[PDB]
Amino acid sequence: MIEPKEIVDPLTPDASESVNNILKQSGAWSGDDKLQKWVRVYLDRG
Amino acid sequence: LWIVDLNKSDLERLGTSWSGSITIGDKLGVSLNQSSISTLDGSRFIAAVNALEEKKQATVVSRPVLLTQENVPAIFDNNRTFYTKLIGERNVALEHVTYGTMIRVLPRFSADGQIEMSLDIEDGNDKTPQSDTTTSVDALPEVGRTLISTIARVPHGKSLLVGGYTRDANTDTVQSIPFLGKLPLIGSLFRYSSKNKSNVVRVFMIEPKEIVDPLTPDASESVNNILKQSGAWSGDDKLQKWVRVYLDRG
Amino acid sequence: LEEKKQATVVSRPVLLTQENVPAIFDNNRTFYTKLIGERNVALEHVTYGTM
Amino acid sequence: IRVLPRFSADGQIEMSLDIEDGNDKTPQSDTTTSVDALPEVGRTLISTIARVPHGKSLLVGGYTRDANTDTVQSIPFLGKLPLIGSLFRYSSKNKSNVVRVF
Amino acid sequence: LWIVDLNKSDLERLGTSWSGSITIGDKLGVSLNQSSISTLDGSRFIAAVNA
């Protein structure tokens, strides 16, 4: 089968809230660590 | 960009399957299910039951980051090899999967503030027939190869999808004996049922952002918080400081 | 011997472009399944390609 | 690493970067701690011009990864009775999470 | 330039997995999990635990 659709809008909600609902529920969240947060924090908010 | 994978599968196997032969007085030989009498004369008929089931679930989320100027190309690619510990040190073996990634882009600015880019991306492992033992494939999940070739524009600081793949599947079979598999008392001792079900999504996202500022705090304070807490700091040594000090402050 | 077999599989790719520009998507996963036995060891596998 | 730098007017530096780092893919270190001794880092390659103000530090590219794995292998009938039903399980979790940035 | 790496992993493995076969009076043979009787007649069923 086939079906296209037109798209003009960004994703709602945002992608940074999608994966942070994945990683805190699949059991792989990695922001608690006080050894690795010193270099992820350069990398999440700019 | 955001790679993301979700895998989920369960499988069950239960039932018997019979074979073998009998004999009567060296005058007649009755065999069940292709058991040749030319290899067996008194070996009576046997059975085989299978019982095993499991539930598998695995996720993997990876992301590359890279910056350019506008109207200039750039390439990023990467491939690590992930090992896992097969059980045994003298009875020795390993198994390993390479995990490759590639991305090249060509961005520009618009008038109203949105970014337009030009994407070829790749991700996956190479097809390797390996990990022969049952949990050896279970250790490291597999993700297939993929390739996009797409220009796509997106408003400032927000996230748009660029392509994906989903898949759902079942399987059902009931293998049995024709006459004796329907009587109510022990008729379900002659079944052989094996369901199977897996369902997998995988999608590539994208989001750019504009950047004008240097990193806050500085990088020399980042690694000096790493090395004094991971336990590898090397400024205490009175034999090696005489040449690192030419090298930290100019 | 007799049996009854039934199987379904439903898959979908998604992708976007602009208008009047080409684009390619292709994919191939390999699906393993657990043959019964760990020391009596064997596997079997099927690649599933899409373009 | 190869580069090609120049000065700007206001004091910032603009450079031209191709860098590489890693080991070559070697199937080796067969014993269990032999891989554990020396860690592995994958190959990487950048091709990027990037400018940065004087004396401060800017990021040029990186890679992170998170993963799980869960499986519960058991016997269908006898794996649910309360008394010794958990003697027929086979559970094996797995979890790794790795960052790396230039 | 500054290379930096952080790696972290943990892994656990626990449980059993069974196999083997029995016999009754040289008249019938019941086997669990692909144990062929064509290699074994009196070798009773075994287990394997990993921890």
Author numbering:
A (entry chain O): 512 to 557
B (entry chain N): 308 to 557
C (entry chain O): 359 to 409
D (entry chain M): 410 to 511
E (entry chain M): 308 to 358
Give me lines lifted from the publication on this model.
Although the more peripheral N-terminal N0 and N1 domains were of lower local resolution, the map was of sufficient quality to reveal secondary structure elements for the N1 domain in particular allowing us to position 15 copies of our prior InvG34–173 crystal structure for that domain (PDB 4G085) further expanding the defined model of the injectisome. The final secretin model spanning all domains (residues 34–557, N3 domain loop 228–251 disordered) was refined with density restrained symmetry refinement in Rosetta and notably reveals the dramatic conformational changes involved in secretin gate opening during needle assembly, a fundamental and functionally critical aspect of this giant gated pore family. Overlay of the needle complex and prior closed basal body reconstructions illustrates that the primary sites of conformational change upon needle assembly are in the conserved core secretin region: the N3 ring domain—the tightly oligomerized foundation upon which the secretin assembles7—and the inner β-barrel and membrane associating lip of the central secretin domain, all of which have reoriented to accommodate the presence of the needle filament. The N-terminal N0 and N1 domains, outer β-barrel and C-terminal surface exposed S domain conversely show very little structural difference between assembly states; as with the static IM ring components they appear to provide a highly stable scaffold or shell to buttress the inner conformational changes required for needle passage.
